[PDB]
């Protein structure tokens, strides 16, 4: 069939396609996300929408089970197969052990798959990073990100995509334990963190939450404008 | 000039294995020490930012009950060898009803340290440290991408390897005890790390015939660092 | 018998310019009915049908495979299918499973879409085609319908005498068999309009 | 450039360079000759001893394919052993299937089509081996075939393969195939195997001789080099 | 150097370079010396270590009840031809219910290591075997090569600066035939003491000695049953 | 053989398939041919010049039937022609086994086009250098189709391929027309093959086949010599 | 990196600090209408803005003509809009 | 006909070479073998595995 | 022209060429052989020659006249290994014609088979295109004798009198000067032209131990290689 | 053996897939297709590439492929590669009709295709597909739909769309002529013939060069209406009347 090693070691020790193909992560949409103690909140930004056309087909926060949310960066085409394979994997886990899918298990699935997808013959490695957030069984919320290397890695909050150093540098000024003592402080915390992100005109900000027992709720552009209202009024109070 | 992925050098050896050895040098460090009482072990997690949770990172996974491990370099390459090496230990136990010795594990991995090619892709980029106690006592082992497996009494790896070995033969002798060696590792770690040594940076791992198990919990390490 | 698991029959009688296909729909397991609304006559394109009888699983499954390849064939070429082509299609589809056979006996009845030439044919389970000029029958009961249609069939038939001929033949034929019954549906189709009537049969 | 690397590419002057490189790879190996008489086939291979290297009887370039067929290989050696195993297996197939002993013609075809079959792809390289095939049967007579690395198989009365090739086949036209008995032809080989490859290049050497024909009754074997020792008894007396 | 690429490409001089580079991988291994008498066969190796604290990497590995091999060069391929070596031993031990003679074992090594020297994308094996055993006709000392050309010698040596071992052995090959074991072994590792620089030992912790005999099964000694052999040697000259 | 299986046909920096363009140049280096549909059947004309007087014209035929009502000629290279000739020969007969019916030419050019386009992408081959003209008389209206090395398929009234196809194209723009008879297509076909021929055209040079609606019939050098007598 | 809404507004307003066209220029609808492209062509569309108005010799704006003249550059960037999804 | 097939061309003055092989004669009225031999040397053609489509 | 790897494998040039086949058309010219086939009225003649550069090479092995079946003969040019490897495929496909279709294969169809396999060698990009040139004769029902030629480009091909190889560019020019006339073809006319057409080429007028003549004639339709004595009868029969 | 390899799969050292860009540049040639915002209807537009007077016009569809009872698609680019994709795609739709006795919804038909094109981009050393085709149709859940394909395999749903490079100006014209829910199919067809008038360079919009395929939901017909030239010509004269009327402002 197709016998050729695409991804080989460079003489200075690096793999190229792993440590080069993160540029496709660097040139995609941004996505952030924090975890509250009770309700998590993640959201994609820099949507660059045509603003006269359809929007449900460009939805890039999805679910595997209701227990688990998605978020990713990079080119979405390669991410689709990772999502569907992850879903087929997390259903047979329900066919086995009768608890719902723990998030650390499914992150080891995407990470292990993406590793052996780098390792094998004649296969271009994936160019996506992704986030996997879900309040598990026994009510405990946590999050992980992926890597084209395939190294799952548990953060407290996110910055992936364009300017991950900008937002990831910004959330150190977030991490005061007051944030988040309230869930509205968590959501307006995410959107106020996406103020330093791209244009933030209330159009390209798509956020979604999960209240630890509920299915994930794609919020309409109704309270995003109100959180921009209390955020801008709070900046009016800042002087 | 991308030539044969399996081609020898003018010196000469395998080009891609020699390139694979340099991939260990940018990975994080680790310290193993063989004791007459057991095997202590050390690593550094290398926290990248205060964003990250520090305790989800694994550099020590424990293969059987009685055989420890330490990985290095690219971790996602190491996880495959971990999960399959566990299967080889269990297959030993279910054909044989006895514990697989610490030696034969690394034959059972290093026999496929070299399987790359096109028919029949790249070699692995990890340098493992195996510990454990079989009937032959506490053994401390070390394998490379080349499969050249050897016993090492007190092995360092990674970026710190040169200064850690070089400083480490000075402070080692034949009759080391355990709690001497445990605080004898963190001196080297706080010399070789760039962040301040505290409760979130490193993790120890010990395995003994009579102190087991005795795995790896927090707040032991708080007492361990404060003895400096 | 193995055909007598569900019972059932299909009759198709060529008339002058119109063709009538009739069948029963009782559905049951060897002694015991389950429902009456079961369908053994399938539309295949326009102004064309196929009857099916025998074991009900091969009726539904062979119906779905034939509908599959038929939709692919009328989506390969813009024309409708000619009925000879349908007959050899069913013959190949039965003959692919030569050794483990489908237990059905299909009856293809329909007008040629080029003209108003009628056409009827019936096939064995191995897949032997057979073209006749008067009638074809397929089911557990057969000697009854050969007893009727060799004494009520005339060569040149207006749709009234065709409908009443196939009505008497189906009613008196099925009411002598035991395992079938519970209603008789009659598709009388002509050049103008497709007409479906359900007779007033015995319920026992 | 670029026309010599792969085997499956013609060169613009119209020949294949990997085959031509395979021809002169055998050119560096030592001289091994052969000749047939009216009722037998005599082989001879000169072998190289510098100081110590090997015990007497190591890596003998005389092989034994069938009961009545033998090799005399020269060139690279490992691929010659591979051809020995394959020709061995082919004689096993003919022997198992058709019931009688393999003629030398079919064996030359079925081996030479493999040696040709490795010159059509860039999967493999062309072989670097050339070998003799001697045989005798009473319904057949003595045949002597010659296979080159290119795949050409044909028939000699006598041949020579090695460095000293032309000088070691210059003198064979002095001998007469038709009349001579092979028992003479043994020392009639050993005289010029001792004469060719003069001792300034390599200091010492050692001789093998293998002899199949009517006197051995179909079986191919090495002559006992000690027995009759006819070689050096003539060869030290052949310098003047 | 564009024809130095693969194992397929012949040279314009007639020397396939991948084989030569694999011979270079043979020379980079440590020294080992195998030499036979008429009644015994002895092969002696010299270990090296990575550092002081790491134990010395062993060379001589047990294979059958009479077949033993040394090694130099790569290690993983030595485990590969080791496992093939065991498996072809106990195949015929399983079928014919007799042990294998050595002289038909090594043709399976040549026909085993042949095919990865011809087809595309297959490297040769960096290998340094010094095979020793009994058939019924006595001892044998063979050697291999990555070009798969096996030599029946009376004594050889392969590894780093092993030519000095040879130039020791040629002036004693007339006396390496009759003598029994206790001086045969030290006649062995004198060649090892010529493979070293003349300012460091010749220690006990590194040399390993393997012997195969008639009333003596193949045995590996390691520093401590070696310690009775290293006693009583001559001093290195000035 | 090895599983190399990589497509040597890739995209350009402009976005042009390079091997298909070069294969169309190899079509342009081929022999000229023309084929005209006219109102009862389709006449295919080809132009076959033997390179010497030593040659035999009785052996190799260019008009090659596929069914008893379907003809097929080319403009390109013969050794790549005969392979997909035989592929069409086997390929029509599965349609005659499954459906038990004479295969439509429209279905032929779909399937042969699928073979050829599917062959432009597979493992390590050049594309075919052949441009076909496929005729036939199915269901009452005679058809004439043209394929190409790009795997495409057109539905021409009266086209020409090979050498000087812009010359024969403009010649068949005006002189070819609304409707003719079967003999009247032969006149203008022999004329447009007489556009770019040598100084003489005999029964051995041209070779002309027709499709009646009652069935195919490849013509003989008797009538091929009688019609061109009568220069066109 | 390619400019953002903050850089493009600071690019054009500062470029026009010396000279504007008919004054009155507001940069809110300029960066909002065309999304997106570098601040290169934003001077070019403004180059032809006062250039087409120069047929009136100084100052005027035709609503049907201005959006029609803007269509030329709008389509120029809208011919190559996708990549991708460059991402 | 025959010399026209092998013409290069190699047009104008090879026809003069056809006359310069008449001075090669040795013959009063140029023989047929003189002409044919002149054009066949230059220039050569190598056929036919490809153009045979004609 | 050139662009890319078109000078190396069988992919298209920008001008429409493909260079590997037009290198194969002069892969024949290393052989050094003239071979002429002439179709008479009721017969057909192959003429060849051989080169015997050694006195130790045989006369019995180097004959290029290979017999395919008992009604089909052939002769080979080009290089030797490709020529012989073509022959077992010819014999094997003739035998499978005998097993599958039950009657003896016409000489027409075997060249279509060999031409299509040579096409598959040409079509796929990673296999060498077999630079030999195939020449057949044979007998058909009511069609007289036939001659066919198969070049290594993949076309079956066969004419009244054809010759390809080394010297044949002038030999075809002689056969044009000899065929188109009012002469008929008797048997010794075809044989006496088959020598003299080649003797005009080489200008040697040599011994009858050099040319090998295979012939077929519908009195006894079996392929037949002439004995040297009757070859001498033809060769002095032409000398007036 | 590997030095003849063309490396169609690997990332290129600047950031992007090198081959998919040159894939999209071929879609940028030779294609023009679009669809309109339409209730109780949906339309497709097609530009005749070969408008010569010597074709047969007997196919009865030149750029519209009818792949179910309810759906269709519009080939752009290398046509016979789409003649692979419509055989594959039609077989996918028909096997879903086998497995469920119910008509295939359009979304999973789109993803079921794009996993194959994506499957050639991910691995193989293989020439990718060079067709970016559209989708129309009806479904049970969402009424009417439009979709978009890429050689990368990333799909988007539109309400007015862009094929190919000449249609970016059509996207500017569609945003400048935007509405929300007006069909009234004479308004949508007047807008579509307007867009093909001002975008395509040949003046006056000749009646042969364009092609419109509509889809009206009828219970339970769901008619895929491919309209002939006799109802194209009076639509062209309607738009020319609207241009003559609208130009009177100046």
Nearest to B63 by CA among B103, B90, B25: B90
> Any idea which fold A1-239 has?
3.60.20
Strand, coil or helix: what is A119?
A: helix
- Residue J228 has what DSSP assignment? -
Torsion angles phi and psi, residue A155, rounded to 5 = -100, 170
Torsion angles phi and psi, residue B196, rounded to 5 = -70, 135
Residues of G in contact with J28 (CB under 8 A): 80
Both tokens assigned to J84: 């692979």
Taking the alpha carbons of E96, E100, E104, E109 in that order, is the dihedral positive or negative?
positive
CB neighbourhood size of I136 (10 A):
25
Q: Which residues contact A102 (CB under 8 A, 6 or more apart)?
A: A136, A137
In angstroms, the Cα distances linking A181 to A177, A193, A195 are: 7, 16, 21
Q: After which residues is chain H broken (C to N over 2.5 A)?
A: none
Instruction: Answer whether I125 sits within 8 Å of F8, measured CB to CB.
Output: yes
DSSP string, A183-202: HHHHHHHHHHHTTSSS--SS
Burial of B76 (0-12, 13-18, 19+ CB in 10 A): buried
Q: Which residues contact A15 (CB under 8 A, 6 or more apart)?
A: A7, A8, A9, A118, B122, B125
CA neighbours closer than 13 Å in the CB half-sphere of residue F11: 23
Query: Hey, which bits of chain B come out as E strands?
Result: 30-34, 39-44, 69-70, 128-130, 133-134, 137-138, 141-143, 150-151, 202-204
DSSP string, chain E: -TTSS-SSPPPSSS--HHHHHHHHHHHTSPPEEEEE-SS-EEEEEE-B-SSSSBPPBP--EE-SSS-EE---S-SHHHHHHHHHHHHHHHHHHHHTSSPPPGGGTHHHHHHHHSGGGTSTT---------EEEEETTEEEEEE--TT---EEESEEEESTTTHHHHHHHTTTTTSSSS--HHHHHHHHHHHHHHSS-TTS---SSSEEEEEE-SSS--EEEESTTTTTTSSS-PPPP-
Cα distance between residue C119 and residue C132, in whole Å: 8
> Number of folded domains in chain D?
1
Both tokens assigned to C33: 């009915």
Instruction: Answer whether J91 sits within 8 Å of C75, measured CB to CB.
Output: no
Instruction: Answer whether I22 sits within 8 Å of H40, measured CB to CB.
Output: no
Residues of D in contact with F1 (CB under 8 A): 121, 123
Domain range summary for chain I, segments of one domain joined by + = 1-240
Contact present, A and B (at least 3 Cβ pairs less than 8 Å):
yes
Domain range summary for chain B, segments of one domain joined by + = 1-228
Both tokens assigned to D34: 């052969």
Contacts 24+ apart (CB under 8 A), G13-22: G15/G39, G15/G43, G16/G46, G21/G46, G21/G49, G21/G50, G21/G53, G22/G50, G22/G53, G22/G59, G22/G61
Cα I137 → chain centroid:
8
Show which of residues 117-146 on chain I sit within 8 Å of chain J, judged by CB atoms.
Answer: 126
Cα distance between residue C200 and residue D142, in whole Å: 100
Q: What is the resolution of this structure in A?
A: 5.8
- What value does the CA radius of gyration of chain H take, rounded to a whole number of Å? 13
Strand, coil or helix: what is C33?
A: strand
CATH class of I1-240: alpha beta
E152–D contact, CB cutoff 8 A: yes
F90–D contact, CB cutoff 8 A: no
The length of chain B is 228
Residues of I in contact with F22 (CB under 8 A): 12-14, 16
Residues of G in contact with A48 (CB under 8 A): 35-36
- Residue J247 has what DSSP assignment? G
A58: nearest CA in chain J?
J156
In angstroms, the Cα distances linking I67 to B180, F177, J71, J161 are: 91, 57, 64, 70
Domain range summary for chain A, segments of one domain joined by + = 1-239
Residues of B in contact with E75 (CB under 8 A): 146-149
Torsion angles phi and psi, residue C99, rounded to 5 = -90, -40
Q: Is the peptide bond before G58 cis (omega within 30 degrees of 0)?
A: no
Nearest to J17 by CA among E89, A78, B126, E80: A78
Which CATH number goes with the domain that contains F99? 3.60.20.10
Instruction: Answer whether B6 sits within 8 Å of E22, measured CB to CB.
Output: no
Least CB–CB distance from F117: residue in J8, J50, J84:
J84
Show which of residues 23-82 on chain I sit within 8 Å of chain H, judged by CB atoms.
Answer: 24-26
Cα distance between residue D232 and residue D204, in whole Å: 14
Cα distance between residue D61 and residue D75, in whole Å: 10
CATH class of E1-238: alpha beta
Cα distance between residue C201 and residue C77, in whole Å: 42
CA distance E13 to chain D (A): 7
CATH code for B1-228? 3.60.20.10
Instruction: Answer whether I128 sits within 8 Å of D7, measured CB to CB.
Output: yes
The length of chain D is 240
Show which of residues 2-41 on chain F sit within 8 Å of chain D, judged by CB atoms.
Answer: 2
Least CB–CB distance from G85: residue in J154, J162, J166:
J154
Buried b (16+ CB within 10 A) or exposed e, A5-27: bbbbbeeebbbbbbebbbbbbbb
Q: Residue for token digits 């690096």?
A: A14
Q: β-pairing, F206-211 with F216-218? A: antiparallel
Domain range summary for chain E, segments of one domain joined by + = 1-238
Question: Which element (helix H / strand E) includes B83?
Answer: helix B75-96
I131–D contact, CB cutoff 8 A: yes
- Residue J54 has what DSSP assignment? T
CB D80 within 8 A of CB D88: no
D84: nearest CA in chain E?
E111
E53–B contact, CB cutoff 8 A: yes
Cα distance between residue F160 and residue B62, in whole Å: 77
F22–I contact, CB cutoff 8 A: yes
Helices (H), D99-181: 104-117
Rounded-to-10 torsion of CA E43, E46, E49, E53: 90
CB J83 within 8 A of CB J72: no
J23: nearest CA in chain F?
F15
Contact present, J and A (at least 3 Cβ pairs less than 8 Å):
yes
Show which of residues 99-138 on chain J sit within 8 Å of chain C, judged by CB atoms.
Answer: 101
CB F28 within 8 A of CB F148: no
Cα distance between residue B218 and residue J96, in whole Å: 56
A149: nearest CA in chain B?
B76
Give residue D8's domain range: 1-240
Chain F: touching chains (3 or more CB pairs < 8 Å) = A, C, D, H, I, J
Cα H1 → chain centroid:
10
Both tokens assigned to A179: 């944030």
Nearest to A117 by CA among A89, A92, A82, A68: A82
Nearest to B30 by CA among B1, B64, B9, B59: B59
DSSP string, H1-54: -HHHHH--S--TTHHHHHHHTTTT-S-SS--HHHHHHHHHHSS-----SSGGG-
Give residue J116's domain range: 1-250
Taking the alpha carbons of E27, E29, E30, E34 in that order, is the dihedral positive or negative?
negative
Residues of F in contact with J8 (CB under 8 A): 6-7, 10
CA terminus-to-terminus distance, chain C: 21
Nearest to F158 by CA among F138, F137, F135, F139: F135
Nearest to D1 by CA among E1, E120, I24: E1
Instruction: Answer whether H52 sits within 8 Å of I173, measured CB to CB.
Output: no
Q: β-pairing, D153-155 with D141-147? A: antiparallel
Strand, coil or helix: what is F201?
A: coil
Nearest to B128 by CA among B79, B86, B71: B71
CA neighbours closer than 13 Å in the CB half-sphere of residue F212: 6
Nearest to F160 by CA among F133, F184, F191, F180: F133
Instruction: Answer whether A77 sits within 8 Å of J157, measured CB to CB.
Output: no
Least CB–CB distance from F117: residue in J57, J81, J125:
J81
Instruction: Answer whether I126 sits within 8 Å of D154, measured CB to CB.
Output: no
CA distance C74 to chain J (A): 10
Residues of D in contact with E153 (CB under 8 A): 52-55, 58
Helices (H) and strands (E) in chain D, counts: 5, 10
Residues of A in contact with B146 (CB under 8 A): none
E80–B contact, CB cutoff 8 A: yes
Instruction: Answer whether I5 sits within 8 Å of J1, measured CB to CB.
Output: no
Contact present, G and J (at least 3 Cβ pairs less than 8 Å):
yes
Nearest to E57 by CA among H52, D18, B106, B46: B106
**C to F CB pairs, distance under 8 Å:** 20
Residues of D in contact with J1 (CB under 8 A): 6, 122-123
CA distance J111 to chain C (A): 21
Domains defined along chain C, listed by start: 1-204 (3.60.20.10)
Instruction: Answer whether D152 sits within 8 Å of I80, measured CB to CB.
Output: yes
In angstroms, the Cα distances linking D125 to D22, D88, D121, J170 are: 9, 22, 8, 59
CB C21 within 8 A of CB C10: yes
Q: Which residues contact H18 (CB under 8 A, 6 or more apart)?
A: H3, H34, H35, H38, H39
Show which of residues 105-164 on chain D sit within 8 Å of chain E, judged by CB atoms.
Answer: 118, 122-126, 128
Least CB–CB distance from D122: residue in E117, E120, E170:
E120
In angstroms, the Cα distances linking E211 to E43, E133, G24, J14 are: 7, 9, 102, 62
Residues of F in contact with C92 (CB under 8 A): 97-98
J4–I contact, CB cutoff 8 A: yes
- Residue C42 has what DSSP assignment? E
Q: Residue for token digits 């990196």?
A: G1
Both tokens assigned to J197: 């008038």
Torsion angles phi and psi, residue D167, rounded to 5 = -70, -25
Both tokens assigned to J228: 């002939």
Residues of C in contact with J67 (CB under 8 A): 75
CB E103 within 8 A of CB E160: no
Which CATH number goes with the domain that contains D67? 3.60.20.10
CB D7 within 8 A of CB D126: yes
CB D222 within 8 A of CB D63: no
């Amino acid at each position: 069939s197709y016998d050729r090693a695409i991804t080989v070691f460079s003489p200075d020790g690096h793999l190229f396609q792993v440590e080069y193909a993160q540029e496709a992560v660097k040139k995609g949409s941004t996505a952030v996300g924090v975890r509250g103690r009770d309700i998590v909140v993640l959201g994609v930004e820099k949507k660059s929408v045509a603003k006269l056309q359809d929007e449900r087909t460009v939805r890039k926060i999805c679910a595997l089970d209701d227990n688990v949310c998605m978020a990713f960066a990079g080119l979405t085409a390669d991410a689709r197969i990772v999502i569907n394979r992850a879903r087929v994997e997390c259903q047979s886990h329900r066919l086995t052990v009768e608890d719902p899918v723990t998030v650390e298990y499914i992150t080891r699935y995407i990470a292990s798959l993406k590793q052996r997808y780098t390792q094998s013959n004649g296969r271009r490695p994936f160019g996506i990073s992704a986030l996997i957030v879900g309040f598990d069984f026994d009510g405990t919320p946590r999050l992980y990100q992926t890597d084209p290397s395939g190294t799952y890695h548990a953060w407290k909050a996110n910055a992936i995509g364009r300017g991950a150093k900008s937002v990831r540098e910004f959330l150190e000024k977030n991490y005061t334990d007051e944030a988040i003592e309230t869930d509205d402080l968590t959501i307006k915390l995410v959107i106020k963190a996406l103020l330093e992100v791209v244009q933030s005109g209330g159009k390209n900000i798509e956020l979604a939450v999960m209240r630890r027992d509920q299915s994930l709720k794609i919020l309409n552009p109704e309270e995003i404008e109100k959180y921009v209202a209390e955020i801008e009024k709070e900046k009016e109070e800042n002087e | 000039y991308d030539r044969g992925v399996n081609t020898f050098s003018p010196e000469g050896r395998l080009f891609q294995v020699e390139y694979a050895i340099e991939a260990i040098k940018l990975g994080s460090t680790a310290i193993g020490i063989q004791t007459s009482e057991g095997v202590c072990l050390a690593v550094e997690k290398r926290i990248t930012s205060p964003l990250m949770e520090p305790s989800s990172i694994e550099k020590i996974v424990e293969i059987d009950a009685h055989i420890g491990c330490a990985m290095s370099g690219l971790i996602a390459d190491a996880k495959t060898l971990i999960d399959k090496a566990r299967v080889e230990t269990q297959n030993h136990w279910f054909t044989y009803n006895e514990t697989m010795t610490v030696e034969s594990v690394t034959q059972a991995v290093s026999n496929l340290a070299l399987q790359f090619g096109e028919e029949d892709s790249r070699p692995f980029g990890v340098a493992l440290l195996f510990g454990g106690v079989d009937e032959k006592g506490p053994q401390l082992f070390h394998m490379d991408p080349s499969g050249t497996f050897v016993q090492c009494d007190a092995r360092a790896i990674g970026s710190a390897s040169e200064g850690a070995q070089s400083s480490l033969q000075e402070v080692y002798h034949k009759s080391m005890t355990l709690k001497e060696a445990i605080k004898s590792s963190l001196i080297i770690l706080k010399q070789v790390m760039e962040e301040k040594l505290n409760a979130t940076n490193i993790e120890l791992a010990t395995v003994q015939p009579g102190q087991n198990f005795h795995m790896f919990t927090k707040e032991e390490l708080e007492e361990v660092i404060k003895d400096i | 018998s193995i055909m007598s698991y569900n019972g059932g029959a299909v009759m198709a009688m060529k008339g002058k310019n119109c063709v009538a296909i009739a069948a029963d729909r009782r559905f049951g397991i060897q002694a015991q009915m389950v429902t009456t609304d079961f369908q053994k006559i399938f539309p295949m394109g326009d102004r064309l049908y196929i009857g099916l009888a025998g074991l009900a699983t091969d009726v539904q499954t062979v119906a779905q495979r034939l509908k599959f390849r038929l939709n692919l064939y009328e989506l390969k070429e813009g024309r409708q299918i000619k009925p000879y082509t349908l007959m050899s299609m069913v013959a190949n589809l039965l003959y692919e499973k030569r050794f483990g056979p489908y237990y059905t006996e299909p009856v293809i009845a329909g007008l040629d879409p080029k003209t108003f030439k009628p056409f009827i044919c019936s096939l064995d389970l191995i897949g032997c085609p057979m073209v006749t000029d008067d009638f074809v029958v397929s089911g557990t009961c057969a000697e009854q319908m050969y007893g009727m249609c060799e004494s009520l069939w005339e060569p040149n038939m207006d749709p009234d005498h065709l409908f009443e001929t196939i009505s008497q033949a189906m009613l008196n034929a099925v009411d002598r068999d035991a395992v079938s019954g519970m209603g008789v549906i009659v598709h009388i189709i002509e050049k103008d309009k497709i007409t479906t009537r359900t007779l007033k049969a015995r319920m026992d | 450039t670029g026309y010599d690397l792969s085997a499956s590419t013609f060169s613009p002057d119209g020949r294949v360079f990997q085959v031509e490189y395979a021809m002169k790879a055998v050119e560096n190996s030592s001289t091994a000759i052969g000749i047939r008489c009216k009722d037998g086939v005599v082989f001879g291979v000169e072998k190289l001893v510098l100081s110590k290297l090997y015990e007497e009887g190591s890596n003998k370039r005389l092989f034994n394919v069938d009961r009545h067929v033998g090799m005399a290989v020269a060139g690279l050696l490992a691929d010659a052993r591979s051809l020995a195993d394959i020709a061995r297996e082919e004689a096993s197939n003919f022997r198992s299937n058709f019931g009688y002993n393999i003629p030398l013609k079919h064996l030359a075809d079925r081996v030479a089509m493999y040696v040709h079959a490795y010159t059509l792809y860039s999967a493999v390289r062309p072989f670097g081996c050339s070998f003799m095939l001697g045989s005798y049967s009473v319904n057949d007579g003595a045949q002597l075939y010659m296979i080159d690395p290119s795949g050409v198989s044909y028939g000699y009365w006598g041949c020579a393969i090695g460095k000293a090739r032309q000088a070691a086949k210059t003198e064979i036209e002095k001998l007469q195939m038709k009349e001579m008995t092979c028992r003479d032809i043994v020392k009639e080989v050993a005289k010029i195997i001792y004469i060719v490859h003069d001792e300034v290049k390599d200091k010492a050497f050692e001789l093998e001789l293998s002899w199949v024909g009517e006197l051995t009754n179909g079986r191919h074997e090495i002559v006992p080099k000690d027995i009759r020792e006819e070689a050096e008894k003539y060869a030290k007396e052949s310098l003047k | 150097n564009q024809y130095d690429n693969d194992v397929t490409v012949w040279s314009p001089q007639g020397r396939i370079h991948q084989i030569e580079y694999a011979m270079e991988a043979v020379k980079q291994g440590s020294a080992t010396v195998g030499l036979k008498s008429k009644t015994h066969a002895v092969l002696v190796a010299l270990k090296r270590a990575q550092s002081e604290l790491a134990a010395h990497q062993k060379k001589i590995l047990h294979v059958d009840n009479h077949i033993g091999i040394s090694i130099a060069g790569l290690t993983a391929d030595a485990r590969l031809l080791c496992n093939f070596m065991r498996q072809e031993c106990l195949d015929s031990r399983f079928v014919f219910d007799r042990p294998l003679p050595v002289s038909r074992l090594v043709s399976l090594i040549g026909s085993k290591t042949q095919i990865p020297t011809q087809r595309y994308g297959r490297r040769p094996y960096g290998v340094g075997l010094l095979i020793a055993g009994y058939d019924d006709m006595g001892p044998h000392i063979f050697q291999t090569c990555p070009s798969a050309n096996y030599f029946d010698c009376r004594a050889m040596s392969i590894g780093a600066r092993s030519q000095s071992a040879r130039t020791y052995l040629e002036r004693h090959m007339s006396e390496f035939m009759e003598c029994n074991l206790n001086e045969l072994v030290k006649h062995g590792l004198r060649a090892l003491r010529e493979t070293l620089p003349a300012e460091q030992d010749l220690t006990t912790k590194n040399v390993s000695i393997g012997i195969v005999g008639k009333d003596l099964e193949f045995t590996i000694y390691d520093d401590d049953d070696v310690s009775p052999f290293l006693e009583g040697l001559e001093e290195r000259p000035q | 053989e090895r599983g190399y299986s990589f497509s040597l046909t890739t995209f350009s920096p402009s976005g042009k398939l390079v091997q298909i363009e070069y294969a169309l140049a190899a079509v342009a280096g081929g022999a000229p041919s023309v084929g005209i549909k006219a109102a009862n059947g389709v006449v295919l004309a080809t132009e076959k010049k033997q390179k010497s007087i030593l040659y035999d014209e009785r052996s190799v035929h260019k008009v090659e039937p596929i069914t008893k009502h379907i003809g097929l000629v080319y403009s390109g290279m013969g050794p790549d022609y005969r392979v997909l000739v035989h592929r069409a020969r086997k390929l029509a007969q599965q349609y005659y086994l499954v459906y038990q019916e004479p295969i439509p030419t429209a279905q032929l050019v779909q399937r042969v086009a699928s073979v050829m386009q599917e062959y432009t992408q597979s493992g390590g081959v050049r594309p075919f250098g052949v441009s076909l003209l496929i005729c036939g008389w199915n269901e009452g209206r005679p058809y004439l189709f043209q394929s190409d090395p790009s795997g495409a398929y057109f539905a021409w009234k009266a086209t020409a391929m090979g050498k000087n196809y812009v010359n024969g194209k403009t010649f068949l723009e005006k002189r070819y027309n609304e409707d003719l008879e079967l003999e009247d297509a032969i006149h203008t076909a022999i004329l447009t093959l007489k556009e770019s021929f040598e100084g003489q055209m005999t029964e051995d040079n041209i070779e002309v086949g027709i499709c009646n609606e009652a069935g195919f019939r490849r013509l003989t050098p008797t009538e091929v010599k009688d019609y061109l007598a009568a220069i066109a | 990196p390619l400019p953002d809404e903050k850089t493009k507004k600071r690019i054009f307003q500062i470029h026009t600090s010396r000279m504007t066209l008919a004054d009155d220029v507001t940069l809110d609808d300029l960066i909002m209408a065309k999304d997106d492209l570098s601040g290169a062509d934003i001077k070019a569309i403004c180059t032809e803005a006062g250039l087409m108005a120069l047929r009136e010799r100084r100052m005027k704006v035709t609503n049907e003509d201005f959006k029609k003249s803007k269509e030329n550059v709008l389509y120029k960037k809208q011919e190559g809009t996708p990549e991708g999804l460059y991402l | 006909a025959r010399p026209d097939k092998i013409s290069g061309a190699d047009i104008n003055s090879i026809c003069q070479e056809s006359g310069m092989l008449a001075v090669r004669e040795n013959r009063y009225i140029v023989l047929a073998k003189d002409f044919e031999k002149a054009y066949k040397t230059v220039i050569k053609k190598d056929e036919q595995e490809h153009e045979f489509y004609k | 022209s050139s662009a890319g790897f078109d000078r190396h494998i069988t992919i298209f040039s920008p001008e429409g060429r493909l260079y590997q086949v037009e290198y194969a058309f002069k892969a024949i010219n290393q052989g050094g052989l003239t071979s002429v086939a002439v179709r008479g009225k009721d017969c057909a003649v192959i003429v060849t020659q051989k080169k015997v550069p050694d006195k130790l090479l045989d006369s019995s092995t180097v004959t290029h006249l290979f017999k395919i079946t008992e009604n089909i003969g052939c002769v080979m040019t080009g290089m030797t290994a490709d020529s012989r490897s073509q022959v077992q495929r010819a014999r094997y496909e003739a035998a499978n014609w005998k097993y599958k279709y039950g009657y003896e294969i016409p000489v027409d169809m075997l060249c279509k088979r060999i031409a299509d396999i040579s096409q598959v060698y040409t079509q796929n990009a990673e296999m060498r295109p077999l630079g030999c040139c195939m020449i057949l004769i044979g007998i058909d029902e009511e069609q007289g004798p036939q001659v066919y030629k198969c070049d290594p480009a993949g076309y079956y091909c066969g004419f009244k009198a054809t010759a390809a190889g080394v010297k044949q560019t002038e030999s075809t020019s002689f056969l044009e000067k000899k065929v188109k006339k009012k002469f008929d073809w008797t048997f010794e006319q075809t044989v006496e032209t088959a020598i003299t057409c080649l003797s005009t080429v080489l200008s040697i007028d040599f011994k009858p131990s050099e040319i090998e003549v295979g012939v077929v004639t519908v009195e006894n339709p079996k392929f037949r290689i002439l004995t040297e004595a009757e070859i001498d009868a033809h060769l002095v029969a032409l000398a007036e | 053996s590997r030095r003849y390899d063309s490396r169609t799969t690997i990332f290129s050292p600047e950031g992007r897939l090198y081959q998919v860009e040159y894939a999209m540049e071929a879609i940028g040639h030779a294609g023009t297709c679009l669809g309109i915002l339409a209730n109780d209807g949906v339309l497709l537009a097609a530009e005749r590439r070969n408008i010569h007077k010597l074709l047969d016009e007997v196919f009865f569809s030149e750029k519209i492929y009818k792949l179910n009872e309810d759906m269709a698609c519009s080939v752009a680019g290398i046509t016979s590669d789409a003649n692979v994709l419509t055989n594959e795609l039609r077989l996918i739709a028909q096997r879903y009709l086998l497995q469920y006795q119910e008509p295939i919804p359009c979304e999973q038909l789109v993803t079921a295709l794009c996993d194959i094109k994506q499957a050639y981009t991910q691995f193989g050393g293989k020439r990718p597909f060079g067709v970016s085709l559209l989708y129309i149709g009806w479904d049970k859940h969402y009424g009417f739909q439009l979709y978009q394909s890429d050689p990368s395999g990333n799909y988007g749903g539109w309400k007015a769309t862009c094929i190919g490079n000449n249609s970016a100006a059509a996207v500017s014209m569609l945003k400048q002529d935007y509405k929300e829910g007006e069909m009234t199919l004479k308004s949508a067809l007047a807008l579509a013939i307007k867009v093909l008038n001002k975008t395509m360079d040949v003046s006056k919009l000749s009646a042969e060069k364009v092609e419109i395929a509509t889809l009206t939901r009828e219970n339970g017909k769901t008619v895929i209406r491919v309209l002939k030239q006799k109802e194209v010509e009076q639509l062209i004269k309607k738009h020319e009347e609207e241009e003559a009327k609208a130009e009177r402002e100046k």
